[PDB]
Design a binder for this molecule. Structure first.
Ligand SMILES: C[C@@H]1O[C@@H](O)[C@H](O)[C@H](OS(=O)(=O)O)[C@H]1O[C@@H]1O[C@H](C(=O)O)[C@@H](O[C@@H]2O[C@@H](C)[C@H](O[C@@H]3OC(C(=O)O)=C[C@H](O)[C@H]3O)[C@@H](OS(=O)(=O)O)[C@H]2O)[C@H](O)[C@H]1O
Ligand SMILES: [Ca+2]
Ligand SMILES: [Ca+2]
Length: 481
């Protein structure tokens, strides 16, 4: 109902993809030197992460040049008015798991943003908790002076004519740490190498634009059962970013908490507020949760997120946060009957959103850790608090999904089914999902990533096929809102 495909546009025939085998701790040191592209985590690296952004009549897309032998960082600008796709090839090539390019590293997406204030392009890429270390360190010195990888353009590059959309619009690293004339990777976003430690050991670049046109950016520090979210802001006036400031303290047990915890979720700018929603991973390994537990949520009344944080009830939040209890909504673990240590498994299936009408929505998924037990239990959960309601409605009458999106008066589930995009739609503040759209002909897709804007879903997709160089398409789906 109202949902329709506006355009499908091919971006390239050969974007990088890991067609090889799934290495592991024992074997990651013997990666196949043949044509196939082995990998350590997942196969996806193109059309993956924060890799698609609409700017005016353009859409910018980021990707890794295909061919296990190529792997170059790529940026393409698509002119939805003329149909032209102009692409810049950067010198940096995917460096793989812990710095060995023969092992595909699906964490190492290419995040993307374009400033509406000054038309600068911003790219953070190919990162997974890298630091300065030496030969005896886990990274064998492969990221010295290059553990945070930022590229960015002079002002106005976004709107430049097709002929001028070239690498020369981007700023070289000419600092004392520069690695040569093809060095386009900056170690910090502040333009001050003194901040470099502030940009160390980070993963997952993600950009948002404030309601006032300000670029926001956050990344993950750490992981497993000890992590933190860090965020900063783009100062267009001066063409540099602020330093990262934390949402929560790392090493919570040293900051007054009973235990360390990692975060599995996202910060999002929604309704003009920086917000966060996540499930934690406590370092406690004797309680009932093998991995994650809980659903947590908070928002900041400060335009930049520097303080004035509150939980869903408007209660002030200790900031930076130490104890996740302050912002706990509910416990998904309560929906499965097990209590023995590590018996409750929560990993996949979590996301959240807040509608323009201030409906708050969480989805998650809980199952028995032991898949073989006779009393195996598995549920998907949808927890939502309608705008003016007092308490959350929490139901297992829900099929499960990996993401939830919102636009206008609605929430959406969007993904691939048998290789073809579908859209499910429900009113904000309800559990009333219905399939309202399902592509049913054409080349099928392996995977993709979605960006919501303009009442449209921009579905940046990779086409199914063999090998490690596959085509990419952009679909612009009107959501009918
Ligand atoms: C991130 C940490 O990095 C260093 O600090 C350190 O290497 C540490 O590793 S450790 O040396 O083994 O202790 C790392 O800790 C891992 O962080 C991962 C992360 O991405 O944050 C965690 O992986 C996540 O959780 C896994 C359970 C999940 O694994 C999938 O699902 C399961 C399962 O549910 O039981 C089993 C399979 O192995 C796998 O499908 C991870 O998925 S992934 O596709 O493998 O990436 C991931 O979401 C990890 O658990 C931490 O040890
Ligand atoms: Ca550099
Ligand atoms: Ca535990």
């Amino acid at each position: 109902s109202g949902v329709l495909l506006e355009s499908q546009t091919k971006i390239t025939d050969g974007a990088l993809h890991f067609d090889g085998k799934k290495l592991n701790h024992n074997t990651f040191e013997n990666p196949s030197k043949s044509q196939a592209y082995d990998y350590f985590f997942g196969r996806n690296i193109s059309a993956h992460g924060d890799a698609v952004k609409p700017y005016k009549h353009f859409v910018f897309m980021t990707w890794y040049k295909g061919g296990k032998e190529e792997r170059n960082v790529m940026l393409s600008r698509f002119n939805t008015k003329t149909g032209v796709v102009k692409t810049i090839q950067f010198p940096h090539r995917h460096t793989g798991f812990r710095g060995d390019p023969l092992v595909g590293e699906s964490h190492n997406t290419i995040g993307l943003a374009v400033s509406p204030l000054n038309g600068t392009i911003h790219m953070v890429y190919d990162m997974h908790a890298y630091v300065d270390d030496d030969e005896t360190g886990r990274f064998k010195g492969r990221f010295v002076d290059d553990f945070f990888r930022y590229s960015f353009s002079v002002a106005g590059a976004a709107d430049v004519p097709d002929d001028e959309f070239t690498l020369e619009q981007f700023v070289k690293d000419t600092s004392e740490l520069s690695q040569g004339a093809d060095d386009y990777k900056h170690l910090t976003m502040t333009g001050n190498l003194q901040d470099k430690e502030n940009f160390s050991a980070l993963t997952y670049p993600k950009f948002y634009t404030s309601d006032d046109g300000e670029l926001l950016h956050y990344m993950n520090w750490g992981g497993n059962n000890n992590g933190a979210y860090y965020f900063n802001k783009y100062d267009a006036k001066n063409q540099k970013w602020t330093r990262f400031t934390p949402f929560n303290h790392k090493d919570q047990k040293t900051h007054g908490n009973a235990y360390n915890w990692g975060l599995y979720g996202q910060m999002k700018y929604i309704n003009g507020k920086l917000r966060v929603g996540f499930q934690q991973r406590s370092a406690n390994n004797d309680d009932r949760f093998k991995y994650q537990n809980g659903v947590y949520y908070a928002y900041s009344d400060h335009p930049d997120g520097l303080g004035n944080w509150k939980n869903v009830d408007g209660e002030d939040m200790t900031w930076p946060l130490v104890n996740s209890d302050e912002i706990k909504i509910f416990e998904p673990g309560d929906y499965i009957d097990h209590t023995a240590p590590n018996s409750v498994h929560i990993v996949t299936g979590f996301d959240w959103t807040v509608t323009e009408n201030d409906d708050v929505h969480f989805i998650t998924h809980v199952r028995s850790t032991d898949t073989k037990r006779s009393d195996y239990k598995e549920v998907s959960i949808h927890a939502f608090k309608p705008a003016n309601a007092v308490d959350f409605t929490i139901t297992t009458d829900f099929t499960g999904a990996d993401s939830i999106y919102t636009s206008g008066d609605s929430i959406f589930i969007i993904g691939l089914k048998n290789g073809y995009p579908f859209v499910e739609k429900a009113k904000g503040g309800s559990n009333d999902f219905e399939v309202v759209y399902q592509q049913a002909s054409g080349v099928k897709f392996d995977h993709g990533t979605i960006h919501i804007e303009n009442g449209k879903a921009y579905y940046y997709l990779m086409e199914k096929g063999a090998g490690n160089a596959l085509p990419l398409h952009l679909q612009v789906i009107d959501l009918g809102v």
